[PDB]
Amino acid sequence: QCTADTLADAVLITTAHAWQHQGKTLFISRKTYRIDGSGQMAITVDVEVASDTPHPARIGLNCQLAQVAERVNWLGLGPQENYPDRLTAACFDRWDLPLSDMYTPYVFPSENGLRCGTRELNYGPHQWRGDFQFNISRYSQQQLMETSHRHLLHAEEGTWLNIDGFHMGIGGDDSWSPSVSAELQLSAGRYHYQLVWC
């Protein structure tokens, strides 16, 4: 579905998508975009996950921004990278770091640089507000998946932004068997989050 309506003081966009693999519906996403007279775009997301599929790594949004800014400013957890499994050391405050500090250069590339518990994120002219986890870097998730050494990574044209309502734990009791505790898995079946852009 993709439907647009003009309210008294806003424009309402309603969409719905189904992610499918070989005839089986894995996830369903329903979104409303509300653009008001103050220029802000409020995004509401509701997601249903099939109970028989493995719980997903994350639930969130992803885009590649054209601009490349020098600093990332945000109100959330810690200066350093932190995950729902590994955030007891991070502190809630206003943090300012260069864009390079938002990427952790693990020798074997992988998902990295997430910051949880974030209420506000500033990058260039843009501002996002809500309660989300984010990472921001010059490398897409696909490139990190495909590249076996950090020295072979190449910065992309713009900056990749992932904003997640929910993120699964990282585990770590051992690295040769599943070790993410049951309560850190994305097993709720239904999920909801909200985001305001600019």
Add this chain to the structure above:
Amino acid sequence: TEAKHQQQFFQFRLSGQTIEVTSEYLFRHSDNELLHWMVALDGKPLASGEVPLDVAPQGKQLIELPELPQPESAGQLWLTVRVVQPNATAWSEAGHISAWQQWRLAENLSVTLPAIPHLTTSEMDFCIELGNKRWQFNRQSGFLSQMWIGDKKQLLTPLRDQFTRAPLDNDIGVSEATRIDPNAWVERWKAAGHYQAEAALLQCTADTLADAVLITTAHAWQHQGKTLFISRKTYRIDGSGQMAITVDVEVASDTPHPARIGLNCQLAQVAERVNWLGLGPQENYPDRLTAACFDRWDLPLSDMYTPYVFPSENGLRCGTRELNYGPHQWRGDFQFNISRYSQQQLMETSHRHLLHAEEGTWLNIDGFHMGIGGDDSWSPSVSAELQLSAGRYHYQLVWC
């Protein structure tokens, strides 16, 4: 029933498509035991069978189910097993159920898709028509105040948010009659003003979409100038007559976590039966639902009330996808209780024999509900993960 389920002498493990049964008996072989199994989409049964149990003390038996059906219709498949004693004993009758277990099998997400309601606005109300149905939103209060089918009214009390419950004995938690406790949940709720919080209207706006009417409201519950909770709701009435309700609630981090987050109304009708698709058939709570089974349940309205001698919050059913009272249907993922007694009357009445049925039927629908505790009844005993401690909450309801 929760005690019976947790203490049962057979334990079950499912590794598709094999049920592994483990006996916790120390001395006796399973010679009076028959395993029944059933697969349902909603119940709505699809398949069933019977397997005799032949397991040694502390032994194991693998039970291979035949090819399970794979319907293309949307919905969740559930497997239920029960151990039945076919022969009577000195202490039980033929057919006694001694153990059971349930699992989720396979889900098919619904991917399919589905006159224009007329909105009339006055300075006191927003009033919507569709054919023979009418909804009335009081613009001063911001709540749905009346609903019509034909010419008959459906509500005696407006549909409003509820954040409190009539305190359980675990909530009162004062062992000696003279030793008052400021740490009891009921005392914290009273001191914070949860039972006296007044709702202040923040916004009430109506818009006419292409095929629906959109009502947006917002309220703030305050006690001596301190905002406790904020509720933001959207009501969407479409051309099929259904009203979709979306609720987002923010809870102040410094207030005690509320007993519940949900809605409450008094219906005019008094029907004889309650039919729901969820956990049952008995009363069950987020703390105490391991014994309840997901199925289609039908009970008289009197069975929806547990007559505790000291009145309190009672009769909740969790994990509910659909609820059918007389003419109405509610769909979502919620907990509900339904009875002839309001929460206020249960709070104020000290003996069950002094309760009097009210004019209509009180309905509480909760997105979220606190645990009941029970490790002891003289200190707080609700674990941290069954408390409503998240800052923000969201739930969705369809009223048809």
